[PDB]
Amino acid sequence: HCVKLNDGHLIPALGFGTYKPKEVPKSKSLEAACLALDVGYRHVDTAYAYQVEEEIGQAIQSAIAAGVVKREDLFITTKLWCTCFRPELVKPALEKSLKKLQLDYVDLYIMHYPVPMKSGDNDFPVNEQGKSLLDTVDFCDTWERLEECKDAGLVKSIGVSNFNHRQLERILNKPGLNYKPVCNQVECHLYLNQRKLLDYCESKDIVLVAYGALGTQRYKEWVDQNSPVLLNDPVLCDVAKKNKRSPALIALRYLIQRGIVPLAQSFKENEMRENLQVFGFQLSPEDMKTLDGLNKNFRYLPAEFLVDHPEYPFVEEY
């Protein structure tokens, strides 16, 4: 199951996410990527800023060396981080990611955010008060260098992450645009269903890719009864029981049926295998409408480290 991108390439309709919490040893990301490949994932989404590209690359090479997959069978995404948005730094940042990944090209390379930060080795440069050290780079200038990377054959498709409507319009309307973004990767789940941004993206043939697809599971959310937890939602539970699937699978299927490509994040074989079963059932029109009703516009990943920049993406309505 794939989704057609606006440049003719195809993206598998479910991806494997590789975000790694800081406390987790990086070797566990290597293990999880090998397991995901064995389970049957072919779309692997990573990012320079997750600091596990080397592990993901080693997993891929080990699976290729084992003969279980060929490179052409895989769809690999990585991301340009905020500290590398200066135009002269873009192609070298991709080349470094490719070296770490042990790849000659990626299938998809995306701007991680629309906001640039001070260049340098620290991914989260800060002043003595902890405020982010920000830059003045127009993301349209960064975009021109991603286009150059595509023309150089280092990446098949290019896109963005965490852009709002106004920012997508800036790219689409920029003078001398060569390639439209193929995707906008954003937080998206039953509690932040992204209807408005989705409808815009559909109108421009931009695919919405979802991270954080199961909402927050942080301790504080479970303790405060007033703060709803998506995986504990009683309406979701009713739909899950009706369809004889888990709440998590309902939550992922909801996104798939709206044309969104979710990234399923897990270190556990059983969950990896369950999530891949999302193509084995369909939600009815009534159930989709019930699930639409869960939206709360709860953004759990607001990227507060970017809030002081004029291009902070999340204050605007969409």
Short mmCIF file of C-alpha atoms in Angstrom, two decimals:
data_model
loop_
_atom_site.label_atom_id
_atom_site.label_comp_id
_atom_site.label_asym_id
_atom_site.label_seq_id
_atom_site.Cartn_x
_atom_site.Cartn_y
_atom_site.Cartn_z
CA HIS A 1 0.00 0.00 0.00
CA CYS A 2 1.50 3.26 -1.15
CA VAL A 3 0.59 6.89 -1.71
CA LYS A 4 1.52 8.76 -4.89
CA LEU A 5 3.73 11.82 -4.38
CA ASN A 6 3.41 14.83 -6.63
CA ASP A 7 6.81 14.16 -8.26
CA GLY A 8 5.79 10.64 -9.35
CA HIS A 9 7.49 8.77 -6.53
CA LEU A 10 5.58 6.41 -4.24
CA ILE A 11 5.70 6.40 -0.43
CA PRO A 12 4.57 3.36 1.59
CA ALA A 13 1.34 4.24 3.36
CA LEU A 14 2.62 3.29 6.84
CA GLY A 15 6.07 4.28 8.04
CA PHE A 16 8.29 3.13 10.88
CA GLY A 17 9.29 5.98 13.15
CA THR A 18 12.71 6.16 14.79
CA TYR A 19 12.44 8.93 17.35
CA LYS A 20 14.43 7.76 20.39
CA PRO A 21 13.86 9.12 23.89
CA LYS A 22 17.10 10.51 25.31
CA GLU A 23 17.40 7.88 28.08
CA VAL A 24 17.14 4.90 25.71
CA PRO A 25 20.50 3.48 24.61
CA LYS A 26 21.15 4.09 20.94
CA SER A 27 21.91 0.41 20.32
CA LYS A 28 18.21 -0.22 20.97
CA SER A 29 17.39 1.89 17.90
CA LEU A 30 19.65 -0.34 15.81
CA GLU A 31 17.86 -3.41 17.15
CA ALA A 32 14.40 -1.91 16.59
CA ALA A 33 15.17 -0.97 12.99
CA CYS A 34 16.40 -4.50 12.22
CA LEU A 35 13.24 -5.91 13.76
CA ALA A 36 11.01 -3.52 11.84
CA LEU A 37 12.64 -4.58 8.57
CA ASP A 38 12.11 -8.21 9.50
CA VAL A 39 8.43 -7.59 10.42
CA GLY A 40 7.96 -6.02 7.00
CA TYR A 41 8.30 -2.25 7.24
CA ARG A 42 9.85 -0.66 4.17
CA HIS A 43 9.35 3.06 4.90
CA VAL A 44 11.77 4.12 7.63
CA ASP A 45 11.61 7.71 8.87
CA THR A 46 14.55 9.21 10.74
CA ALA A 47 16.19 12.60 11.30
CA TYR A 48 19.63 14.04 11.89
CA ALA A 49 18.41 15.53 15.17
CA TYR A 50 17.31 12.14 16.55
CA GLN A 51 21.07 11.27 16.66
CA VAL A 52 20.50 7.68 15.54
CA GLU A 53 21.22 7.89 11.81
CA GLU A 54 24.33 5.73 12.29
CA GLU A 55 22.25 3.01 13.95
CA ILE A 56 19.51 3.14 11.32
CA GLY A 57 22.14 2.96 8.60
CA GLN A 58 23.80 -0.04 10.21
CA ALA A 59 20.46 -1.82 10.50
CA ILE A 60 19.73 -1.22 6.81
CA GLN A 61 23.17 -2.36 5.72
CA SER A 62 22.92 -5.47 7.90
CA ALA A 63 19.57 -6.36 6.31
CA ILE A 64 20.97 -5.77 2.80
CA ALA A 65 24.06 -7.86 3.63
CA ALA A 66 21.72 -10.62 4.88
CA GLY A 67 19.78 -10.51 1.58
CA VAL A 68 16.43 -9.81 3.26
CA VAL A 69 15.89 -6.54 1.35
CA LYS A 70 17.51 -4.58 -1.43
CA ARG A 71 18.02 -0.82 -1.27
CA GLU A 72 15.40 -0.28 -3.99
CA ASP A 73 12.81 -1.97 -1.77
CA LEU A 74 13.19 0.67 0.95
CA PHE A 75 11.86 4.20 1.34
CA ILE A 76 14.23 6.11 3.64
CA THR A 77 13.49 9.59 4.94
CA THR A 78 15.77 11.88 6.88
CA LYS A 79 15.57 15.54 7.85
CA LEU A 80 17.60 18.73 7.67
CA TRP A 81 17.91 20.23 11.14
CA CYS A 82 17.40 23.92 12.06
CA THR A 83 21.13 24.56 12.62
CA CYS A 84 21.83 23.67 8.93
CA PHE A 85 19.30 25.93 7.18
CA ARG A 86 21.90 28.46 5.99
CA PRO A 87 22.01 27.84 2.22
CA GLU A 88 25.70 26.89 2.13
CA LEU A 89 25.13 24.28 4.85
CA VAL A 90 22.19 22.36 3.32
CA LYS A 91 23.90 20.07 0.82
CA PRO A 92 26.79 19.34 3.22
CA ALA A 93 24.25 18.46 5.92
CA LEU A 94 22.57 16.00 3.56
CA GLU A 95 25.94 14.56 2.58
CA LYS A 96 26.78 14.04 6.27
CA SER A 97 23.44 12.32 6.87
CA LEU A 98 24.13 10.05 3.87
CA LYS A 99 27.55 9.19 5.26
CA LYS A 100 26.09 8.38 8.68
CA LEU A 101 23.31 6.32 7.05
CA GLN A 102 25.82 4.54 4.76
CA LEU A 103 23.60 5.42 1.80
CA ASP A 104 24.20 7.03 -1.59
CA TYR A 105 20.74 8.64 -1.66
CA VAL A 106 17.63 9.04 0.48
CA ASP A 107 14.09 8.70 -0.84
CA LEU A 108 12.90 11.80 1.02
CA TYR A 109 14.70 14.73 2.62
CA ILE A 110 12.66 17.31 4.50
CA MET A 111 13.18 20.53 6.43
CA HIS A 112 12.51 19.55 10.06
CA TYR A 113 10.92 22.94 10.89
CA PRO A 114 10.56 26.36 9.20
CA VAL A 115 12.73 28.07 11.86
CA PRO A 116 16.55 28.27 11.62
CA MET A 117 18.84 28.19 14.65
CA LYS A 118 22.48 29.24 15.07
CA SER A 119 24.78 27.01 13.06
CA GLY A 120 27.21 24.82 14.92
CA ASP A 121 27.64 21.43 16.52
CA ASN A 122 25.04 21.91 19.26
CA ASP A 123 21.61 20.94 17.94
CA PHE A 124 19.96 23.12 20.61
CA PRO A 125 22.13 26.23 20.90
CA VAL A 126 21.10 28.39 23.84
CA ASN A 127 22.11 31.51 25.75
CA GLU A 128 22.95 31.51 29.46
CA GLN A 129 19.24 31.80 30.29
CA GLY A 130 18.34 28.79 28.14
CA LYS A 131 16.70 30.76 25.34
CA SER A 132 17.40 29.49 21.83
CA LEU A 133 20.06 31.14 19.68
CA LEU A 134 18.09 31.84 16.50
CA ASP A 135 18.98 32.81 12.91
CA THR A 136 17.64 34.92 10.10
CA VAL A 137 17.40 32.61 7.10
CA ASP A 138 14.39 32.61 4.78
CA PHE A 139 13.17 29.05 4.44
CA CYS A 140 12.58 29.76 0.74
CA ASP A 141 16.34 30.19 0.38
CA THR A 142 16.91 26.92 2.23
CA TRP A 143 14.36 25.31 -0.10
CA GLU A 144 16.33 26.25 -3.22
CA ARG A 145 19.24 24.19 -1.86
CA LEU A 146 17.03 21.17 -1.22
CA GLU A 147 16.03 21.48 -4.87
CA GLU A 148 19.73 21.41 -5.78
CA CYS A 149 20.15 18.24 -3.71
CA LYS A 150 17.37 16.59 -5.73
CA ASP A 151 18.99 17.68 -8.99
CA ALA A 152 22.31 16.25 -7.73
CA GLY A 153 20.65 12.85 -7.25
CA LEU A 154 21.26 12.76 -3.51
CA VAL A 155 17.53 12.62 -2.75
CA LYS A 156 14.56 11.44 -4.81
CA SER A 157 11.85 13.65 -3.24
CA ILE A 158 11.91 16.76 -1.06
CA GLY A 159 9.42 18.10 1.47
CA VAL A 160 8.89 19.87 4.76
CA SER A 161 7.86 19.24 8.36
CA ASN A 162 5.96 21.43 10.82
CA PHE A 163 5.02 24.10 8.28
CA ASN A 164 1.75 26.00 8.54
CA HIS A 165 -0.54 27.09 5.71
CA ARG A 166 1.09 30.50 5.25
CA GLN A 167 4.54 28.92 5.09
CA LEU A 168 3.51 26.29 2.54
CA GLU A 169 2.01 29.08 0.46
CA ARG A 170 5.32 30.96 0.63
CA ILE A 171 7.15 27.98 -0.90
CA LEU A 172 4.46 27.28 -3.50
CA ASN A 173 4.34 30.94 -4.53
CA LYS A 174 8.05 31.66 -4.45
CA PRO A 175 9.61 33.11 -7.61
CA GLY A 176 11.63 30.50 -9.43
CA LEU A 177 10.22 27.43 -7.66
CA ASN A 178 11.63 24.24 -9.18
CA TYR A 179 9.95 21.50 -7.11
CA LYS A 180 6.93 21.62 -4.86
CA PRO A 181 7.24 19.92 -1.47
CA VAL A 182 5.83 16.40 -1.65
CA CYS A 183 4.81 16.28 2.01
CA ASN A 184 4.29 18.18 5.22
CA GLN A 185 5.13 15.97 8.20
CA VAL A 186 3.21 17.20 11.26
CA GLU A 187 1.87 16.03 14.59
CA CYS A 188 -1.51 14.46 13.83
CA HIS A 189 -3.81 12.20 15.84
CA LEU A 190 -7.42 11.88 16.96
CA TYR A 191 -7.02 14.83 19.35
CA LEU A 192 -5.28 17.08 16.73
CA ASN A 193 -6.81 15.80 13.51
CA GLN A 194 -5.42 18.59 11.28
CA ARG A 195 -8.59 18.87 9.17
CA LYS A 196 -7.85 22.39 7.94
CA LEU A 197 -4.19 21.77 7.07
CA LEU A 198 -5.09 18.39 5.56
CA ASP A 199 -7.69 19.91 3.26
CA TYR A 200 -5.22 22.57 2.14
CA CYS A 201 -2.50 20.00 1.51
CA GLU A 202 -4.88 17.79 -0.44
CA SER A 203 -5.74 20.75 -2.67
CA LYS A 204 -2.03 21.20 -3.46
CA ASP A 205 -1.20 17.48 -3.83
CA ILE A 206 0.96 17.59 -0.68
CA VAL A 207 0.81 14.45 1.47
CA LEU A 208 0.37 14.88 5.21
CA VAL A 209 2.66 12.56 7.17
CA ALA A 210 1.80 12.11 10.86
CA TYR A 211 4.01 11.76 13.91
CA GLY A 212 2.82 11.42 17.49
CA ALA A 213 -0.10 9.48 16.07
CA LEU A 214 -1.22 7.94 19.38
CA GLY A 215 -1.22 11.21 21.32
CA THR A 216 0.58 11.70 24.60
CA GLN A 217 1.01 8.95 27.17
CA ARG A 218 2.97 11.03 29.69
CA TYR A 219 2.38 10.37 33.39
CA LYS A 220 0.79 13.73 34.14
CA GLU A 221 -1.90 13.12 31.54
CA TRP A 222 -3.00 9.82 33.08
CA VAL A 223 -3.05 11.25 36.61
CA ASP A 224 -5.24 14.27 35.81
CA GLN A 225 -8.68 12.95 34.92
CA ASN A 226 -9.39 16.33 33.30
CA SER A 227 -6.61 15.79 30.76
CA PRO A 228 -7.82 13.09 28.36
CA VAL A 229 -5.47 10.36 27.18
CA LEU A 230 -6.16 9.27 23.58
CA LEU A 231 -5.40 5.58 24.16
CA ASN A 232 -7.79 5.61 27.18
CA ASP A 233 -10.62 7.38 25.36
CA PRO A 234 -13.97 5.64 25.96
CA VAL A 235 -15.39 6.54 22.55
CA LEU A 236 -12.28 5.18 20.90
CA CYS A 237 -12.69 2.07 23.06
CA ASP A 238 -16.25 1.60 21.82
CA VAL A 239 -15.19 1.91 18.18
CA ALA A 240 -12.30 -0.49 18.82
CA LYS A 241 -14.59 -3.12 20.36
CA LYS A 242 -17.11 -2.73 17.52
CA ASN A 243 -14.38 -3.31 14.93
CA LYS A 244 -12.56 -6.03 16.97
CA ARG A 245 -9.25 -4.13 16.84
CA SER A 246 -7.15 -2.34 19.45
CA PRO A 247 -7.59 1.37 20.18
CA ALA A 248 -4.14 2.04 18.73
CA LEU A 249 -5.04 0.33 15.47
CA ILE A 250 -8.26 2.36 15.21
CA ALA A 251 -6.26 5.53 15.78
CA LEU A 252 -3.82 4.63 12.98
CA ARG A 253 -6.55 3.50 10.58
CA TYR A 254 -8.41 6.78 11.07
CA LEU A 255 -5.37 8.61 9.69
CA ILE A 256 -4.86 6.17 6.80
CA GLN A 257 -8.46 6.58 5.63
CA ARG A 258 -7.99 10.34 5.51
CA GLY A 259 -5.02 9.94 3.18
CA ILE A 260 -2.44 10.61 5.90
CA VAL A 261 0.73 8.53 6.14
CA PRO A 262 1.30 7.75 9.83
CA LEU A 263 4.63 6.92 11.37
CA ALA A 264 4.21 4.05 13.79
CA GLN A 265 6.71 4.31 16.64
CA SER A 266 7.57 1.25 18.74
CA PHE A 267 10.51 -0.78 20.02
CA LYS A 268 8.34 -3.91 20.58
CA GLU A 269 7.90 -6.70 18.02
CA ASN A 270 4.28 -7.34 19.01
CA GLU A 271 3.29 -3.69 18.45
CA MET A 272 5.28 -3.49 15.23
CA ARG A 273 3.39 -6.53 13.91
CA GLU A 274 0.01 -5.26 15.15
CA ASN A 275 0.49 -1.87 13.52
CA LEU A 276 1.22 -3.43 10.15
CA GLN A 277 -2.23 -5.06 10.34
CA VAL A 278 -3.79 -1.62 9.81
CA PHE A 279 -4.43 -2.56 6.18
CA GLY A 280 -6.56 -5.54 7.21
CA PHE A 281 -9.79 -3.73 8.09
CA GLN A 282 -11.82 -0.65 7.19
CA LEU A 283 -13.69 1.87 9.35
CA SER A 284 -17.25 2.67 8.34
CA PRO A 285 -18.52 6.17 7.55
CA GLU A 286 -20.28 6.34 10.91
CA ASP A 287 -17.15 5.33 12.78
CA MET A 288 -15.03 7.88 10.88
CA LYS A 289 -17.52 10.61 11.84
CA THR A 290 -17.49 9.46 15.49
CA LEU A 291 -13.70 9.61 15.46
CA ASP A 292 -13.68 13.08 13.84
CA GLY A 293 -15.62 14.17 16.90
CA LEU A 294 -12.66 13.40 19.19
CA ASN A 295 -10.67 16.36 17.89
CA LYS A 296 -9.61 18.80 20.64
CA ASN A 297 -6.76 20.73 18.94
CA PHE A 298 -4.40 19.39 21.59
CA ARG A 299 -0.86 19.89 20.32
CA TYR A 300 1.47 17.80 22.47
CA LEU A 301 4.69 18.70 20.60
CA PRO A 302 4.65 22.50 20.33
CA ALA A 303 8.41 22.98 19.89
CA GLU A 304 8.67 25.71 22.52
CA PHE A 305 12.40 26.05 21.74
CA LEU A 306 11.28 27.81 18.51
CA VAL A 307 8.67 30.16 19.96
CA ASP A 308 10.76 33.35 19.89
CA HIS A 309 11.28 33.22 16.11
CA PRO A 310 8.92 35.06 13.75
CA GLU A 311 8.36 31.83 11.80
CA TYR A 312 7.25 29.81 14.81
CA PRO A 313 4.58 27.70 13.07
CA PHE A 314 1.99 26.91 15.72
CA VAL A 315 0.33 30.16 16.80
CA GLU A 316 -1.63 30.58 13.56
CA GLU A 317 -4.98 28.83 13.15
CA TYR A 318 -3.53 26.45 10.54
#
